[PDB]
Amino acid sequence: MRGQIRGLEMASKNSQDGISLIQTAEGALTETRAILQRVRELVVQAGNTGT
Amino acid sequence: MRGQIRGLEMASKNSQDGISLIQTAEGALTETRAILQRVRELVVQAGNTGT
Secondary structure, eight states: OHHHHHHHHHHHHHHHHHHHHHHHHHHHHHHHHHHHHHHHHHHHHHHHTTO | OHHHHHHHHHHHHHHHHHHHHHHHHHHHHHHHHHHHHHHHHHHHHHHHTTO
16 A cells, blocks of 8 residues: 555646746747747748749 | 747738839839820920921
């Protein structure tokens, strides 16, 4: 029992840690998304400025 | 959604820009029209001054 208990709490810590890893990656991708938004704006503007 | 929103406002800016291009060309053609008016006057006057 004890084996699985302390192992289980450790596993939950491990899970939260995985979440925070995801938080970092998610923030990087958030910013990437902002960049790509700006890019698309420049593409549209480029589209009219073909003239 | 956001993609199409900011892209849409940018597209509207692009449209206004196209309008102002048309304003320039239209002014040039306005003046051209004044010239051609003067020309026609000179043609008519030339017509009687064939005599």
